[PDB]
From a paper:
Chuangxinmycin (CXM) is a promising antimicrobial compound targeting bacterial tryptophanyl-tRNA synthetase (TrpRS), an essential enzyme in protein synthesis. TrpRS catalyzes the ligation of Trp to its cognate tRNA, forming tryptophanyl-tRNA (Trp-tRNA), which is required for the accurate translation of genetic codes into proteins. Importantly, bacterial TrpRS exhibits significant structural and functional differences compared to its mammalian counterpart, making it an attractive target for the development of selective antibiotics. Structurally, CXM is a tryptophan (Trp) mimic but is characterized by a unique dihydrothiopyran heterocycle, which distinguishes it from other known antibiotics and contributes to its distinct physicochemical properties.
Numbering used by the authors:
A (entry chain A), B (entry chain A): 1 to 108, 117 to 329
The structure:
Amino acid sequence: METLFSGIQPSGIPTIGNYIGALKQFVDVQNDYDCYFCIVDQHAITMPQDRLKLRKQTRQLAAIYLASGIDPDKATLFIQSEVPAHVQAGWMLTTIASVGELERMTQYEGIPAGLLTYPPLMAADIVLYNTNIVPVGDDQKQHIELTRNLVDRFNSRYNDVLVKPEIRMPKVGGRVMSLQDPTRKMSKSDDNAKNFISLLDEPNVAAKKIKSAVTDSDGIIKFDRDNKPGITNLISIYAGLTDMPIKDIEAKYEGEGYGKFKGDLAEIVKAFLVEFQEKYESFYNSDKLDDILDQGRDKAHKVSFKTVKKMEKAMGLGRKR
Amino acid sequence: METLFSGIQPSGIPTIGNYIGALKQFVDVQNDYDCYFCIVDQHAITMPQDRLKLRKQTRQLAAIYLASGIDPDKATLFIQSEVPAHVQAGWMLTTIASVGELERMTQYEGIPAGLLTYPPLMAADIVLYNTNIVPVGDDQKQHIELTRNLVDRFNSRYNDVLVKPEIRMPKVGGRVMSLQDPTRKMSKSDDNAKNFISLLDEPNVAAKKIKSAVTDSDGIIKFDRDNKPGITNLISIYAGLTDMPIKDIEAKYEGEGYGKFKGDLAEIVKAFLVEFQEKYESFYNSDKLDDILDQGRDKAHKVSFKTVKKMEKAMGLGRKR
Ligand SMILES: O=C(O)[C@H]1Cc2c[nH]c3cccc(c23)S1
Ligand SMILES: O=C(O)[C@H]1Cc2c[nH]c3cccc(c23)S1
């Protein structure tokens, strides 16, 4: 079975685009892949962070992943700083990286040093779990390239202990675009809040955003990206939330206009978030959340400890006991 | 009681100059100061290292410190990589350092990144134990300046958790110079092996080095650095190993020439190393060495864990449990 590793920034609430694109797919692929979902709070502090904002965000992301259906027995859901192997292996790989290499990553008071030195910690996050696949986007290609190069360098210089990962998302979800800018991807950090639907948006507010999505006044319910990106994006959201095939959606709304479709979709979005946020609040406000995060931490520690120890022996750190 | 922290490079055997200058003084000040003696194997790998050379060197330094009289109950003698707090706190301080700051430290395949990023780990080594004094030389002034600045930055930005250290050696030992270059300090890495006496030199070989020290053919036994640095350096070694006051040495050898003094000193050096190396071999070849290093690791972990947890809470890493 292949191992998947995904790093999760505690720096913002995922949107329904992130849910349709990734989170919902993780809920299915966690049965067929050995999945690690790591809330990277040590990467988060490379940026300026408010320390209560950060601890709250971490719990929030954990709760959102659990509310999505991420299963702490099937997958390993943990907080990066709670597993020392990450900075242990991150330091080991730093020593074999070059300054030039790190500087070229930064391209693709002063400048905080974490912004230059985090890539070997990213590599460590991945290779500690013998990861085969990382489900990231084009913006992370250089980081995986460096990861693979560090693995090759480590194995070449000391001896074979580390596995090279590939960029692969096992089941790509639909691409969800900005509701009032259909040519750009939906983003949680938009300055136009009508562009995205947050998973923690009030369900009535989300339904209004479906209604304020920028489309023609009326038309047929047909999937057509290049000519009607507005209604097409909504069809994608509809398909992402109901699992109805797109051709099935077109056949269901044959002879219908936009108002009926957008009305049904707004109610679908509202019902989805009502159900999602009830699970979210129950995890977020429960004592079991710390029990779950402890269990995930212990699972990750068990696996990454052996990797760290193999690395330490290969470099000659510590003792032979 | 003040806390002292000394980092120990596992990269070479200390000389009798290092013994007279530092190690012997540590054996006394460990009664009056809370001393941490940390074998920094994670700093060692910032340089190119042979991995069996490194693990052996680490054990060797531990044994040399114990053979010197460093007492694992009075002081805390441990290996850096065995205490995760060092890289945990090292990463936290990295995020508040600036690239410019780190680059200016480097001044005072490519360039290994550890050579740029190690200073915040040095700062972490120190401040984890609430250190008041660090017994280092002029070459480390920039590193302590950065340490103090990182502590100020950390306390200013988050809240008061870290203590600023000072450069202070509580009891300075004698300065021991190169045996065949009396104007330079003795150094374990000299290309002229007659210049230094290693603590692991064969005792007969050391006695020959006392005899091959560069001095006048003959003279009085008088301490005179500027005019007779050769015999003066030998008087310093004699004083360092016997604790005989220098004026007492001059009075003892009134009416004596160099051959009698150098003969007595060579025999003193030989007897010292015979006794030193018997203790060294017994520690180096004993099973108790791992017991001792475990105990030191546990002592250091207990203290540095609390510091790390205070730092994590201040930055908002992890969870409030
Ligand atoms: O910001 C992001 O999306 C990246 C954050 C991150 C840290 N460590 C890993 C490992 C695998 C994947 C990712 C990450 S994704
Ligand atoms: O190379 C050396 O001498 C330095 C190595 C080192 C690493 N971390 C500390 C903390 C205090 C003092 C020192 C060190 S001395």
